[PDB]
A paper describes a structure:
Deoxyribose-5-phosphate aldolases (DERAs) are acetaldehyde-dependent, Class I aldolases catalysing in nature a reversible aldol reaction between an acetaldehyde donor (C2 compound) and glyceraldehyde-3-phosphate acceptor (C3 compound, C3P) to generate deoxyribose-5-phosphate, DRP (C5 compound). The 3D structures of several DERA enzymes have been solved, and there are also a few complex structures available. The DERA reaction proceeds via Schiff base formation between an active site lysine residue (K167 in Ec DERA) and the donor acetaldehyde substrate. The active site of DERA is located in a deep binding cleft, where the donor acetaldehyde binds to the bottom of the cleft and the acceptor glyceraldehyde-3-phosphate to the upper part, near the cleft entrance.
The crystal structures of two variants of Ec DERA were determined, in order to elucidate mutation-induced changes in the 3D protein structure. The crystal structure of Ec DERA N21K variant, which had lowered specific activity on DRP, and wild-type like activity on DR and acetaldehyde, was determined with and without the ligand, D-2-deoxyribose-5-phosphate (DRP). Diffraction resolutions for all three structures were high (1.5 to 1.9 Å) and the crystallographic R-factors were very low, indicative of high quality 3D structures in each case. In addition, in both N21K crystal structures, there are slight (about 0.2 to 0.4 Å) movements in the positions of altogether three active site loops containing residues G171, G204 and L20, respectively, when compared with the wild-type DERA crystal structure. These small movements slightly narrow the access to the active site of the N21K variant and may thus contribute to the decreased activity against DRP in many of the N21K containing double mutants tested in this work.
Residue numbers in the entry:
A (entry chain A): 1 to 250
B (entry chain B): 2 to 250
Amino acid sequence: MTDLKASSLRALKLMDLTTLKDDDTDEKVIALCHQAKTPVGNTAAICIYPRFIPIARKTLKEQGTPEIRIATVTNFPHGNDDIDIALAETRAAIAYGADEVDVVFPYRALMAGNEQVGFDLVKACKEACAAANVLLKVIIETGELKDEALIRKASEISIKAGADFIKTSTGKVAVNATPESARIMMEVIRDMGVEKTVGFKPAGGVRTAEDAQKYLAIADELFGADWADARHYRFGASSLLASLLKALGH
Amino acid sequence: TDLKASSLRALKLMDLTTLKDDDTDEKVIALCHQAKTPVGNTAAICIYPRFIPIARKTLKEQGTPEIRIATVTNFPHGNDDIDIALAETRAAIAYGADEVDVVFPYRALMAGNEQVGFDLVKACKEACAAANVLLKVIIETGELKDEALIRKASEISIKAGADFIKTSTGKVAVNATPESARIMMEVIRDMGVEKTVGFKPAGGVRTAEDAQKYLAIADELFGADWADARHYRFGASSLLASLLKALGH
Ligand SMILES: [Mg+2]
Ligand SMILES: [Mg+2]
Ligand SMILES: [Mg+2]
Ligand SMILES: [Mg+2]
Ligand SMILES: [Mg+2]
Ligand SMILES: [Mg+2]
Ligand SMILES: [Mg+2]
Ligand SMILES: [Mg+2]
Ligand SMILES: [Mg+2]
């Protein structure tokens, strides 16, 4: 028994087990659902494109794991600033049956000086999600924002507009989660005092058990070792699962 | 008989389609531009639901908001899970579809189950009608094969409220044929629903000469003025280039 084994099981149970690939199929999503039911316990969720939600729901139900949440993505991956498009996609994700929607913040608009559109877009999408008892995560795309001031500002605006989680990255740009970006976002959660109502999700590039342990260590430091539960912490990852299971002897 | 006259008619009745594994926003934007042809606009585009919002914006910004947006649900499998089909249909409506082409559960019908097809079409029609969205039903004539089954699937779809019956998904070995088209249009005529139910051949219709044959069937069964945009569509992609070529473009 090691800290690495303990952190690896913890991380596994916080995973949004993800496939968001150009060649995704029903068959691949079904296999992903089976993978989410691991020999050491269930992941917290899967994360898939909206069109796969109904077959995923059926698959999770039929294998006896209806408690595995179905997350999806909207305004994705580009984070455009057209609220009508973001909201139409979010309403469709809800209609497909999403439990959680991860919407991309309009980060290029923010970089260009538009703080208002990011607030309005997140608020509109939160309104739809809240009306359906769906949790809203907001992807701010730290690898494109780059500057600590912009990462803090995007996080702050998303929280003020009602984000239930803030998420680092889409996984569809070159640069995704870093420990530095993660720490900045979690410091915003702490500084605003919203740790009871806002979770954190690093996504993209988290591939090994040692990586997961490093990201969890930041949460334990800033909030206490009990804070990072499924309502407050998720890993957006895929190949990470095999690394965690290997660390656990499976 | 004139191929230029039939080609201009067919162009204006096209649901210009892309339903491909490599579809992207860029490809759908290009399709929207293609639908605004130098001899007039197609009736609609037909795309996967996730591209509806960007297509609507693209069509509006080029001044052709009258080009309708059709999409597909329960597609292409035609499975018999009504909850899944209805969820996808409701999502298509929420994306902004003008029209939903749902796949009939034809494998269930081939196994002897007529009721699931009725209930599935009816459930999707109820959602669409409440949203002022038109429902087409794909019966997959190339998998049904037998004339009696093609007639039965058409009849069930019409009785459950289809606004259009459509031959095919474009995703199986056999799609539209003139024989299947005639059988389906005969059902429309025989049930007396030619005022409320249109017909759409889809899949494999690639040449102006083929388009001419399908319109000739409609003209024979219903008269030459029946096939307008509310009662006739072509489900096709590369057909548009063949029609434009026949028209000198
Ligand atoms: Mg793709
Ligand atoms: Mg398939
Ligand atoms: Mg197992
Ligand atoms: Mg997209
Ligand atoms: Mg709140
Ligand atoms: Mg610092
Ligand atoms: Mg793109
Ligand atoms: Mg599908
Ligand atoms: Mg079934």
